[PDB]
Amino acid sequence: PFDNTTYKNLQHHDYSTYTFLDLNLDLSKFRMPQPSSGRESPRH
Amino acid sequence: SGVNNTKKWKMEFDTRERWENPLMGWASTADPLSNLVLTFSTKEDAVAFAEKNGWSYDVEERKVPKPKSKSYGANFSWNKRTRVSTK
């Protein structure tokens, strides 16, 4: 049944202090290998 | 940073004794040429003036700043050391 009367974005009511970084940690297995500039840092 | 005082050639003379005046402590001198500074357009003009007046002289070649390669973009290099850590 099409219902245009209820707010469906209520998950964020339960987000906590590490939700964003926990998700970032979860996503780490999906990422392509990062490119390289050829040195550890500009100071090397 | 202004360069306007590096345009002309100067001729000056060797520094001689200055001593303290006993009464006041002022800087006394017996060198009449202590303040003499002449201005010349070119090195050749200065040398010619020194020769005709009988002064031995040293000529120092003009120092011109090296031409530099400046690039704002280098501050953000992908893989070079010129990348700056702060602005």
Swiss-Prot record, chain A:
Localization per Swiss-Prot or TrEMBL: Mitochondrion inner membrane
Similarity section: Belongs to the complex I NDUFV3 subunit family.
Top-level taxon: Eukaryota
Phosphoserine PTM positions: S41
Organism in which the protein naturally occurs: Bos taurus (Bovine)
Name of this protein: NADH dehydrogenase [ubiquinone] flavoprotein 3, mitochondrial
Reported function: Accessory subunit of the mitochondrial membrane respiratory chain NADH dehydrogenase (Complex I), that is believed not to be involved in catalysis. Complex I functions in the transfer of electrons from NADH to the respiratory chain. The immediate electron acceptor for the enzyme is believed to be ubiquinone. May be the terminally assembled subunit of Complex I.
Subunit note: Complex I is composed of 45 different subunits. This is a component of the flavoprotein-sulfur (FP) fragment of the enzyme.
Gene (UniProt): NDUFV3
Taxonomic lineage of the native organism: Eukaryota, Metazoa, Chordata, Craniata, Vertebrata
From Swiss-Prot, chain B:
Function summary: Accessory subunit of the mitochondrial membrane respiratory chain NADH dehydrogenase (Complex I), that is believed not to be involved in catalysis. Complex I functions in the transfer of electrons from NADH to the respiratory chain. The immediate electron acceptor for the enzyme is believed to be ubiquinone.
Assembly with partners or alone: Mammalian complex I is composed of 45 different subunits. This is a component of the iron-sulfur (IP) fragment of the enzyme. Interacts with BCAP31 and TOMM40; the interaction mediates its translocation to the mitochondria; the interaction with BCAP31 is direct.
Signal peptide: none
Organism for this UniProt entry: Bos taurus (Bovine)
Subcellular location: Mitochondrion inner membrane
Disordered: region residues: 61-87
Modification sites for Phosphoserine: S85
Family the entry assigns: Belongs to the complex I NDUFS4 subunit family.
This protein's name: NADH dehydrogenase [ubiquinone] iron-sulfur protein 4, mitochondrial
Posttranslational mods: Phosphorylated.
Boundaries of the shown chain within the full protein: 89 to 175 of 175
